[PDB]
Amino acid sequence: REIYLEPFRLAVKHANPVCIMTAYNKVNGEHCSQSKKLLIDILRDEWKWDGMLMSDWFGTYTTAAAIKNGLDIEFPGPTRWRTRALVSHSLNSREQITTEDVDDRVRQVLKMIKFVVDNLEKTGIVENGPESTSNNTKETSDLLRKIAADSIVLLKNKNNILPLKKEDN
Amino acid sequence: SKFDVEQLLSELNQDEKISLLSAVDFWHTKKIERLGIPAVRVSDGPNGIRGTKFFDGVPSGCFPNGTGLASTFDRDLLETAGKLMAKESIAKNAAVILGPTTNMQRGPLGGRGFESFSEDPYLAGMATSSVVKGMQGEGIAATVKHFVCNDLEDQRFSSNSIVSERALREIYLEPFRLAVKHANPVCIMTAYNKVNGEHCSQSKKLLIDILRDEWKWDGMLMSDWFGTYTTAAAIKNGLDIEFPGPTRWRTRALVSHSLNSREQITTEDVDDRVRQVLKMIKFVVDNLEKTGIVENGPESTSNNTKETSDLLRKIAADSIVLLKNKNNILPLKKEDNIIVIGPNAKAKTSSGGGSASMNSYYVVSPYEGIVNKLGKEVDYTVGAYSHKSIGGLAESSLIDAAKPADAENSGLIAKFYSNPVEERSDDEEPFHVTKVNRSNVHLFDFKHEKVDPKNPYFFVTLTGQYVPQEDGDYIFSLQVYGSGLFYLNDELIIDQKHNQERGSFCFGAGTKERTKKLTLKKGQVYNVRVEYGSGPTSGEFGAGGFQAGVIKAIDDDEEIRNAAELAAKHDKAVLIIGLNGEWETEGYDRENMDLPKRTNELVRAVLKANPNTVIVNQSGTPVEFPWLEDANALVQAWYGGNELGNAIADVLYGDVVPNGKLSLSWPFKLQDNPAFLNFKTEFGRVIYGEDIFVGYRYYEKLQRKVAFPFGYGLSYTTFELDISDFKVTDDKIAISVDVKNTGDKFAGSEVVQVYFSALNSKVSRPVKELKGFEKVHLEPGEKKTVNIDLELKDAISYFNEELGKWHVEAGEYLVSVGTSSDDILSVKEFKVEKELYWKGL
Amino acid sequence: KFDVEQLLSELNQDEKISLLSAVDFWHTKKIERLGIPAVRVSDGPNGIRGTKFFDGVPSGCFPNGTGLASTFDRDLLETAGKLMAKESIAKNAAVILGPTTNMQRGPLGGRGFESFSEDPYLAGMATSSVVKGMQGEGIAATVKHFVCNDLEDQRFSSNSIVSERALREIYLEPFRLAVKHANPVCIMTAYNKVNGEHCSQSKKLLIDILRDEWKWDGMLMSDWFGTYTTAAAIKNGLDIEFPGPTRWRTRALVSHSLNSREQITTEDVDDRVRQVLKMIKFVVDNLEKTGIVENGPESTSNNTKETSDLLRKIAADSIVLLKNKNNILPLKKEDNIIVIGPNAKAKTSSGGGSASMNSYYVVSPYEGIVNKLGKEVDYTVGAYSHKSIGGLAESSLIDAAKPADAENSGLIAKFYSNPRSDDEEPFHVTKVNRSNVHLFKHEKVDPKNPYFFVTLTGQYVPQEDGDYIFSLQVYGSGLFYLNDELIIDQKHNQERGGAGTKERTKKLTLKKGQVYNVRVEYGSGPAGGFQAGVIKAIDDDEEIRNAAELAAKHDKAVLIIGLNGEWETEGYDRENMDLPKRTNELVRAVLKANPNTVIVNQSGTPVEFPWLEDANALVQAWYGGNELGNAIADVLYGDVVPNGKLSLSWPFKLQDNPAFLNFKTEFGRVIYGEDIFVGYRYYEKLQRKVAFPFGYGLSYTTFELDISDFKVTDDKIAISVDVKNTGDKFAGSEVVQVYFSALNSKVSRPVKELKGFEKVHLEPGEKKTVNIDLELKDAISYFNEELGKWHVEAGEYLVSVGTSSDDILSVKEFKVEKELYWKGL
Numbered sequence A: 001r002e003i004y005l006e007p008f009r010l011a012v013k014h015a016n017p018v019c020i021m022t023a024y025n026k027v028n029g030e031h032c033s034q035s036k037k038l039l040i041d042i043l044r045d046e047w048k049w050d051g052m053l054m055s056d057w058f059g060t061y062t063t064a065a066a067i068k069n070g071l072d073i074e075f076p077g078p079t080r081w082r083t084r085a086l087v088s089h090s091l092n093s094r095e096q097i098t099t100e101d102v103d104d105r106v107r108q109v110l111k112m113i114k115f116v117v118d119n120l121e122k123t124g125i126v127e128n129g130p131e132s133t134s135n136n137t138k139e140t141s142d143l144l145r146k147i148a149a150d151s152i153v154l155l156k157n158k159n160n161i162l163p164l165k166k167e168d169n
Numbered sequence B: 001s002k003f004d005v006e007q008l009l010s011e012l013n014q015d016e017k018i019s020l021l022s023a024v025d026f027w028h029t030k031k032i033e034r035l036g037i038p039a040v041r042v043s044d045g046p047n048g049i050r051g052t053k054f055f056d057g058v059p060s061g062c063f064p065n066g067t068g069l070a071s072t073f074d075r076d077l078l079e080t081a082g083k084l085m086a087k088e089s090i091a092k093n094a095a096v097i098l099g100p101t102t103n104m105q106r107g108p109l110g111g112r113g114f115e116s117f118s119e120d121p122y123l124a125g126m127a128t129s130s131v132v133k134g135m136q137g138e139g140i141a142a143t144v145k146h147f148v149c150n151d152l153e154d155q156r157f158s159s160n161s162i163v164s165e166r167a168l169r170e171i172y173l174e175p176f177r178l179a180v181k182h183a184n185p186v187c188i189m190t191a192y193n194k195v196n197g198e199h200c201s202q203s204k205k206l207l208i209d210i211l212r213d214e215w216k217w218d219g220m221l222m223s224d225w226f227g228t229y230t231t232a233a234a235i236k237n238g239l240d241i242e243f244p245g246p247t248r249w250r251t252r253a254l255v256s257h258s259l260n261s262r263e264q265i266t267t268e269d270v271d272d273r274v275r276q277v278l279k280m281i282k283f284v285v286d287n288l289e290k291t292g293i294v295e296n297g298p299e300s301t302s303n304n305t306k307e308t309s310d311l312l313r314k315i316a317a318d319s320i321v322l323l324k325n326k327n328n329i330l331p332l333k334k335e336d337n338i339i340v341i342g343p344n345a346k347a348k349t350s351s352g353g354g355s356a357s358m359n360s361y362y363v364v365s366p367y368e369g370i371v372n373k374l375g376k377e378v379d380y381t382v383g384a385y386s387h388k389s390i391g392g393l394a395e396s397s398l399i400d401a402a403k404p405a406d407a408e409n410s411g412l413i414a415k416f417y418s419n420p421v422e423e424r425s426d427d428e429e430p431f432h433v434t435k436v437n438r439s440n441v442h443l444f445d446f447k448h449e450k451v452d453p454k455n456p457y458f459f460v461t462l463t464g465q466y467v468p469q470e471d472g473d474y475i476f477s478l479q480v481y482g483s484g485l486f487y488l489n490d491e492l493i494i495d496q497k498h499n500q501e502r503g504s505f506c507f508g509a510g511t512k513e514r515t516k517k518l519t520l521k522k523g524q525v526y527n528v529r530v531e532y533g534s535g536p537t538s539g540e541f542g543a544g545g546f547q548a549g550v551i552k553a554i555d556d557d558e559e560i561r562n563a564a565e566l567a568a569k570h571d572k573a574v575l576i577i578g579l580n581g582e583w584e585t586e587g588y589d590r591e592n593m594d595l596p597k598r599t600n601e602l603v604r605a606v607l608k609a610n611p612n613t614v615i616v617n618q619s620g621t622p623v624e625f626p627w628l629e630d631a632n633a634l635v636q637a638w639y640g641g642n643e644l645g646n647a648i649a650d651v652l653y654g655d656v657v658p659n660g661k662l663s664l665s666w667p668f669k670l671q672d673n674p675a676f677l678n679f680k681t682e683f684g685r686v687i688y689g690e691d692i693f694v695g696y697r698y699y700e701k702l703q704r705k706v707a708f709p710f711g712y713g714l715s716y717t718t719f720e721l722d723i724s725d726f727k728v729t730d731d732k733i734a735i736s737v738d739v740k741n742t743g744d745k746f747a748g749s750e751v752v753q754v755y756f757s758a759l760n761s762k763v764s765r766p767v768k769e770l771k772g773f774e775k776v777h778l779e780p781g782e783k784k785t786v787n788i789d790l791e792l793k794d795a796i797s798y799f800n801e802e803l804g805k806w807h808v809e810a811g812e813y814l815v816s817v818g819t820s821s822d823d824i825l826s827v828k829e830f831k832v833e834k835e836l837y838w839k840g841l
Numbered sequence C: 001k002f003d004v005e006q007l008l009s010e011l012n013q014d015e016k017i018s019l020l021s022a023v024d025f026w027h028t029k030k031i032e033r034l035g036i037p038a039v040r041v042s043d044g045p046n047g048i049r050g051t052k053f054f055d056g057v058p059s060g061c062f063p064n065g066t067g068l069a070s071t072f073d074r075d076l077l078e079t080a081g082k083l084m085a086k087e088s089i090a091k092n093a094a095v096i097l098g099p100t101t102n103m104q105r106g107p108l109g110g111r112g113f114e115s116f117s118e119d120p121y122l123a124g125m126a127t128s129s130v131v132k133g134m135q136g137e138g139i140a141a142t143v144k145h146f147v148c149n150d151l152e153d154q155r156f157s158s159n160s161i162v163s164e165r166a167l168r169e170i171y172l173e174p175f176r177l178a179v180k181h182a183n184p185v186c187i188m189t190a191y192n193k194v195n196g197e198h199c200s201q202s203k204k205l206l207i208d209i210l211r212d213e214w215k216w217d218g219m220l221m222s223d224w225f226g227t228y229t230t231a232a233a234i235k236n237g238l239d240i241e242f243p244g245p246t247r248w249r250t251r252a253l254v255s256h257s258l259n260s261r262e263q264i265t266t267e268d269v270d271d272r273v274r275q276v277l278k279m280i281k282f283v284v285d286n287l288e289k290t291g292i293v294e295n296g297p298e299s300t301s302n303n304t305k306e307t308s309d310l311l312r313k314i315a316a317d318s319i320v321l322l323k324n325k326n327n328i329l330p331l332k333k334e335d336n337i338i339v340i341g342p343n344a345k346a347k348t349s350s351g352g353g354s355a356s357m358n359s360y361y362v363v364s365p366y367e368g369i370v371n372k373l374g375k376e377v378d379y380t381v382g383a384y385s386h387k388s389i390g391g392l393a394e395s396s397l398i399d400a401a402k403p404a405d406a407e408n409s410g411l412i413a414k415f416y417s418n419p420r421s422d423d424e425e426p427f428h429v430t431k432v433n434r435s436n437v438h439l440f441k442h443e444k445v446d447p448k449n450p451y452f453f454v455t456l457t458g459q460y461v462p463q464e465d466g467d468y469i470f471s472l473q474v475y476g477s478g479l480f481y482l483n484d485e486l487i488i489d490q491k492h493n494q495e496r497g498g499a500g501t502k503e504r505t506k507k508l509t510l511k512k513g514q515v516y517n518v519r520v521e522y523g524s525g526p527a528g529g530f531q532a533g534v535i536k537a538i539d540d541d542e543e544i545r546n547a548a549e550l551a552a553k554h555d556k557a558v559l560i561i562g563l564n565g566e567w568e569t570e571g572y573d574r575e576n577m578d579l580p581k582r583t584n585e586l587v588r589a590v591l592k593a594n595p596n597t598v599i600v601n602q603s604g605t606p607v608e609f610p611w612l613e614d615a616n617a618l619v620q621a622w623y624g625g626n627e628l629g630n631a632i633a634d635v636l637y638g639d640v641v642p643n644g645k646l647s648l649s650w651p652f653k654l655q656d657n658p659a660f661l662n663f664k665t666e667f668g669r670v671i672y673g674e675d676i677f678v679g680y681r682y683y684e685k686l687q688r689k690v691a692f693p694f695g696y697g698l699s700y701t702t703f704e705l706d707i708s709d710f711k712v713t714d715d716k717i718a719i720s721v722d723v724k725n726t727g728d729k730f731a732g733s734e735v736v737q738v739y740f741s742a743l744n745s746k747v748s749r750p751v752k753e754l755k756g757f758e759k760v761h762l763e764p765g766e767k768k769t770v771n772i773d774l775e776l777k778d779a780i781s782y783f784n785e786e787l788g789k790w791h792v793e794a795g796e797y798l799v800s801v802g803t804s805s806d807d808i809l810s811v812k813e814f815k816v817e818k819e820l821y822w823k824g825l
């Protein structure tokens, strides 16, 4: 609660991120990408966060549990755990999941996509669009310089060695 | 033999191990060459060997269906049928047989009631054991299916059989326990259903605690086809091999990812499953010298011999049960001036529908059997129709009308294309071309390099020429799984592309029948043409299938009177009725116990015109006979396989004297049956409310009368018997029974049935329980002693559900001996004083 | 002003713990310091026994539940519960342990007589009426036994295994109706398990359903000793353990669990205490209306004419006329009659066990007939049918040469510390009226190691010459002495026959007029009990013969038969559905000798009448309470026109019934194999014929009905039925019964379901209109097990209106487009 969830709670409360990516590892015996405690009880019922959960890449471990327990989307394609056969066979055989679980998941994907589409006139994104270096400007350059320069930490400076002055050999 | 399980296990790499956990195609395990582990071929089923294909498959020897087989009450004969299934398997180059089936007819309505043996767990177990010993003695592996409580078809992939441990132990598990104890089958197939909330195929309790830790069985478990539902649980929990390939749940990526991620399974689980698949392969390989099986070998009809014909005929004829024979109507004689009537008379109902069915060498219709017998033409009239759907089109069409009705111009032509007719250029060639004999084109397992098994996407143009035999109205029909358009003379008549409605076709997963009735002219030539697309062309689909059919419309009304008029004019009428493999099939259950359509009307009319009528019924499970009181001769013929017609004739004319006994109770009415209210998957479940009171255990407990009881069958002669010796130690029962043919004309076989009863137990039980039987042949006036010896523990235990173990209780017991569960002739009381609690075999 | 939350804030932990169990058999815990009083509870559902069995204060015994339910009269059941409240105030019991509403899934249930109906709508409306009548008087109801205590066999351990659908539709349903319509102040949890878990600690039942879903806010008490754990019962929702002194919730067990973090938290304890406090608040808030006096005395003050007349009406309206050919009924006062049969002079007012009591009086059916006709009435017993011989105290005297006063009739019971020099004294002496002596508190008696001895004495005087059979049953030890001569030994060799012994008997030739000395030396239970009886021996064949002969010499015979509260009792179920002993032979002979014999049958549950076809007039009396005999007279002569309907299916034979195979606890479990198909739900689905169906009963007049108006909204059904007495002689009541059917549902269902009923009184030729309004969801839902929810499904439905489940007289088809899923009330 106090260490690991907190940064996420703060980011959900203040920034409402659109997406969250589930970790590769387990927490207390259960893989995070199929942990109902983490993905539903805490994120949904408790924090009322309404963004979309994507797995880490290949970080999916079951067909039915992950769907039931709140992993919205498996990355990357092409799907391993969620082929049409696997999922619809689970549904028709009553193993683990219901169409409502599948709905629940799809619904969250739809909301992410909603965010993207509603912003397409602001951002100008182009589906399967090309990739430029259009943002390679001096104005970008100065920002990255600023941001970099403010990151630096001075740990020691005895007897005015720093700053250097250009007179110094 | 060289084949070394442990050595090979230590040599296989992880990729290869995973590849061993799933079939490669519909019927073959994974070849591994660098290690000389061959592909093993498996084949359906419990009453004959279909081989590697439904469509265009090699003909074979179809046996009588299970409930017929069990009615023989003949262990030796059932062993012999096993030997014969094995020979038939070898000709198909199948090293493993997907059978026998032994789920329990807890009610009469099951889609596959016909396929299993008996409601009685003892008769079922012994029958299973007998067939399994016959196959494996010959070196072919058996696969007892379906483990366990797959006792209806409704929603079988999800259905949850909710059953107490006592009933689980005493009814359902028990034929498998008997099979394992006496016959040790090489394989078992896990069921599709759940038991008490868990899919059988990933059930630790069924697959490991019981099969392995308790019974110590060491064979290999396979899934039902597609009956696997998780990747890891199924592996952890004991399912050795997934069928069919290509794999779904068990790709290299799913499994190793599960392994690398520490989710559910370890390499030990994987090795445990592989070891078992290696044990089965070693059975096969160890038996190669003896069997002659050739890896991916060809399929022949090489066992189609007179020796086979005779044996199938003996098996069928001994399965027949005589139910009623008043007024010396039977046997028929060459003299009697008979007529043959009824919807099943010229029908060839050799088997039930589904995976148990096959292409037969030939099937002798019951009409043909009679004709063969008398050496003349025999009067006939159809009486009424009783088909579920219209077939018959390929069976009566020619490629070229101008030529004679050959074996080469008969049927239709099927042409397979990668692309559909609306879209292909005329210089596109078929990728496959087959001559078609049967109207049901069943493409489940069709295989070609142009067809992708992960997405079987393809088309068929089916062509021929139809020449009508009478003027009048004809009904054409089309059923599909996928997409279908039916053309007559290039005008579309049935449309099965648009607005498809779910129906009975294809294990209940296909479309309804759509039809078009058209006025037609005799001798005129009509061009028939079916355009078809497989499942994925038209959810997630299988390859599918389709059926084009035609039938000659009739005046149903007029044919019933006609039939009665004709029967009044004959000395005797022989009325052949019943169900068929469309009414009784894998895929779905019957809806009621009724004979179909006008059948009953037909019977009433014939029994009125002529009381000297013999009724011969073909069904796998009970049907109601409403007009039973008036029917003086009634024969239960089951589905008798290739020789069904000759077996019927044999029994009708007394060259074989009836010796079948019913393997199932025959209630008067559907409402009388124990599972009346719980024979449907509802909210995904089925509650076994009758508990251990299945079959005659139910009827006797309620003193409910049935049309005909478990173990009943008449003969042409008569028998009496009496216990001639009796001796119980503290751990065995030996009993001797003398049986005498008291008649003076016919030689006959009689079945001695041994039942047990506890007299003042404090646990509730059935009144009595079959625990022994023997079949004996006797000439007129001949007398033989038959001996019957069993362990106490096997004859008088009940399963104590509170303690989780079997229990021989101290008290008084009663052995009852007789020739049906309702015809006890001889009893004896004994005391048992030292008790016994046991688990295992 | 009794404040629950402020009291919860003020009680210390030990006081909290002490509220979680009862003090003794009948009382909660007084907390002087905060003004929290001890609350007396008392059995049962058909009248109020009070704080003791032995030497109990007499009381008003009502007819038994299945009889009650058979009235189909909410107003009357409501009046009845109002009377039960007065009877309770008279015993100073602030809380009644009733009504009982478990379900007769089969007929043999030992407590089947005690609940209401196999139909959950009838049970739930009966329950709701009785509770509304109790609580309007400010006396609290306790609905029991929650849930699936549907047989007695091994009830403390019996696991009822039942699907969630049958559980919702049949067994939870009368409790749901009661909560929804009557809000009982209390509920008693069952002794058994449901699906593996004792009810008294089942979170699903006690919290998820009763609290989270139904929002019911009353108090749960265990059945008596029906608590099985310390912590789980407290965690899982059992508010108070009865009886005290506590076994499972001592200060040490409870607080040790708290301090050791084992299972429970102080929050769990508070939650239970809060619920006890709320029940206490109901009692204290009604003290001005009720006049309950804490630990107050118990009186017979409600024994009045008002009470007698009401118990008479209730009993008479319970009765169901089952057959009446040839107008044998009603009888004319001038008919020459003989009264025959084992139940004729019996007083079978109730079934056995906790529901039984000591009555002000019980009018036998014979007496009822005597009172009716105002003169002596010919009689012969015909046959005996007792399970055990009693009747000794009921026919004995202290000193024979003194008249049969009330002070002198019975036996003297002298209690002793030791079984002794001349000079030990009795520490208690009681006048004993009834032969079965049931044990009891005394200062010289060690609470739970109770060792004592009883010297039971008096004089017995034979009224006839010949043979007489004496008897003793003990739980413990005792000896029977007649004229200071041992005659029956229940000390030395003992046989179990359910905690105590088998009956031992001695046949003795006695002489009319002569005074014999009865002395029984009893030994205390290691808390006990015993029964010394005596009966005149009869020649059974000759007595059947005699009754036949006599019957032939009269116009009419009235034969009174059936079971009794020893054959139908809490504690065990029946073995079979047979009438006892030679009853059936008695009946055959009488019917042969006089075909115009009226048969009146007393039982809580169905019995087989094998001779039914030859019986021309047949009446189901039930167990009638104090006024049973008068009520029977009223019906036979037509001062009450029979107006009851069967609250139960009456199959021909035991084997026909749906629970035939699973009505026994085997390996500790009972499989509800029939699922939703209970009672008529079963028989209509199988189209199995029964002797008499649910909701059947005749009248002395004829009636007709039709739906005279019908309306459905998306939310509601309103129906108007016109009913008319088409006779010109008797006024009488008819019961309009409203059933629903689903005509095209995806789901399997009963052929039809009772969902409404109204009882209507009509003078000859009179016509009335009854209205019946219901919300769809009440009328046509089924429980969807897969979804875990009730479902109003779209489709076509049929309402059928009739005078029995068979006798359907008017129907209407309607359509439902608005589908609805729901939970809760």
Ligand SMILES: OC[C@H]1O[C@@H](O)[C@H](O)[C@@H](O)[C@@H]1O
Residues within 6 Å of the ligand: A056, A057
């Ligand atoms: O590159 C796609 C994803 O790959 C994963 O291995 C990393 O953990 C993620 O941080 C990253 O977004």
Ligand SMILES: OC[C@H]1O[C@@H](O)[C@H](O)[C@@H](O)[C@@H]1O
Residues within 6 Å of the ligand: B044, B045, B098, B145, B224, B225, B355
């Ligand atoms: O066809 C192969 C298998 O398929 C399944 O449809 C059936 O349930 C099995 O009995 C059969 O062996």
Ligand SMILES: OC[C@H]1O[C@@H](O)[C@H](O)[C@@H](O)[C@@H]1O
Residues within 6 Å of the ligand: C043, C044, C097, C144, C223, C224, C354
């Ligand atoms: O007698 C007090 C209580 O005891 C238990 O024996 C019964 O089950 C209850 O119905 C009764 O209220």
